[PDB]
Amino acid sequence: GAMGSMERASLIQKAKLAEQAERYEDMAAFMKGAVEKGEELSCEERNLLSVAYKNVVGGQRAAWRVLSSIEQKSNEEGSEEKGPEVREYREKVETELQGVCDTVLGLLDSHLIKEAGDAESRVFYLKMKGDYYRYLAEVATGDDKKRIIDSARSAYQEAMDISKKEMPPTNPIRLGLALNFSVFHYEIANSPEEAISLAKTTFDEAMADLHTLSEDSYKDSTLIMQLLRDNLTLWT
Template sequence: MEVDGDKVGMGEREALLQKAKLAEQAERYDDMASLMKTVTEKGGELSNEERNLLSVAYKNIVGARRSSWRVISSLEHKAEGLEEKQRLAKEYREKVEQELNNICQEVINLLDKHLVSSAQSAESKVFYLKMKGDYYRYLAEVASAEEKNKVVSHSQKAYQEAFDLAVKEMQPTNPIRLGLALNFSVFYFEIQDDSGAAIQLAKGAFDDAIAELDTLNEDTYKDATLIMQLLRDNLTLWTSNDAAAPADEQPDHEEEVKAA
């Protein structure tokens, strides 16, 4: 009996997606990322569901390392003068740093080789370019002095390309456009140390969305208003007297991506 290759392919893809959903429910995000990487490498444009599963998986595994890196860096700083403690903290920080770098590079490779080029809609392209900006930003957080300029430049370029396309093609209330504005403004504040640009971008996005709130439909209302609240929280933080507090004591909000 002849087997339809397309049906086999679809069946295999569906099995990978079901496993990825199981991994998400079990909070095994490394497994989830590996499964969604396999789906992505099979080629073709990802569906919205697949796109969100990929994003959630990598957001969780990179988020765990970013959090660990901040804690260990703080402990390393506090161990100043205690040579052995500081050495151990430095070694451990470098281990976490390497894991974080590997994850970010893996995501950027998927974006460059498969996702950005296969994106058919403006929304998909903005989503992936934003993701590229995010993962270069995470690299910038831990980059050495000689590497930092390069990854910061890549991050800004991806964010700017996404932003220009979003402004041209998407409603101000679109959650993907809002999430981009949120993360791009955090990039300006934390990475570029440019509070003026961060505030201008976040305020512009918030005001534009407020002006068109009546265009929101039921499906996107919750996501859009949540991101608008995060934009407002950051604006409050950045324009207050406490805005200069260290990032680990007063972290800025960035978008949390959840699966549909």
């Protein structure tokens, strides 16, 4: 690893600088280096890891959707034949995206999840595992699409079971997990009713627990609740 010679603390410091500079590829490489030091991650460090890779894969997903749309239009009746280039370049971006997902899943499997014992870390990492299998599922078309989807489902479900046992209904990690699992149901699993039910129950149980929160926690929780509500408005 090219970050093997850099101090753990220096990698974290530079990941924060890269975030300020909107250099998310650098940020992700710095945080990968920090994970590979072998120590567990603090809450702030887990969030740096997540922000870095979410921005990297987000750019790849947006590009893949543009190119896939062009490719699908090229295959409609009346469309002029343009040769292999659209497919080739969509495949190039797709392969790079799969590489980033495999990198994140590899960090989770070696060895972030197995060392994560507290609910906040374990739920965070299992949600991340669900998310990056979900991104693999968005582009999957072959023999393994069903297995990729089930891997995402399984990780989200384990995270859900822990979060319901160990976290209050307003906990932002729990809320963000439920949000993303509801997106999985709607966009990946062809289960819009499950998506709507999950989002509604999550919203309502959080609403009833807001009275326990400080002003700052109330702001954290309601920001995510608003995304649940936005989706319910889109879906119903």
